[PDB]
């Protein structure tokens, strides 16, 4: 399909399958959920009745005592020692098929174009590594929360946006569904656009 520009007014040709396909609600949600789960690290643990410091001696005899039968000071129904099902460090990452990941990414890109949240422009660069310059460049464009995607990563643009929370700078290869969804506006360079079709295929 045809992607219009706002600065050079130059036509761009892009496959409609990767930019004009329908929006799959179910597929995108699964990929987004999978991405969040993969961000976890699951560094937690408790002590079961075997790992609690203590001794296995019976608190009192089985019979004769007037109170409930007890077996150990570390039973889960006892104060200061227990946890019936203690947690262990676990991996929460889940598998997502390559095609499913690509399909969700294609679905997300198409809808950004439909909601005009995606803006394609020519090369986006800053002459000097100054956050002030980048802020001015984004101010006249009426953009405050933007994700800058460029074909080639340059330290000059990387340093300029480092201290800008609402602004992110990324490469085409390092593109994730969550970032595209989260950011209000996405700006893609002409080079950045081309690499997307090649990797998306």
């Amino acid at each position: 399909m045809e992607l219009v520009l706002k600065d050079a007014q130059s036509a761009l040709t892009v496959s409609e399958t990767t930019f004009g396909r329908d929006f799959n609600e179910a597929l995108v949600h699964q990929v987004v959920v999978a991405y969040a789960a993969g961000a976890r690290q699951g560094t937690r643990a408790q002590k079961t009745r075997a790992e609690v410091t203590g001794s296995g001696k019976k608190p009192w005899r089985q019979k004769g005592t007037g109170r409930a039968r007890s077996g150990s000071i570390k039973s889960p129904i006892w104060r200061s020692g227990g946890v019936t099902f203690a947690a262990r460090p676990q991996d929460h990452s889940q598998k997502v098929n390559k095609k499913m990941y690509r399909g969700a990414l294609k679905s997300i890109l198409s809808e950004l174009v439909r909601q005009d949240r995606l803006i394609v422009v020519e090369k986006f660069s800053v002459e000097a590594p100054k956050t002030k310059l980048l802020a001015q460049k984004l101010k006249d464009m009426a953009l405050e929360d933007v994700l800058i995607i460029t074909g080639e990563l340059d330290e000059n643009l990387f340093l300029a946006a480092r201290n800008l929370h609402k602004v992110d700078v990324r490469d085409a290869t390092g593109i994730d569904p969550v970032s595209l969804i989260a950011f209000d506006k996405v700006v893609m360079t002409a080079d950045a656009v081309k690499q997307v079709e090649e990797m998306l295929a």
Partner: peptide, 17 residues
């Protein structure tokens, strides 16, 4: 608050057989 220690046999040794 704290369990007793002597724990004598409270039951009386008198079987009703």
């Amino acid at each position: 608050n704290n369990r007793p220690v002597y724990i004598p046999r409270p039951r009386p040794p008198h079987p009703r057989l």
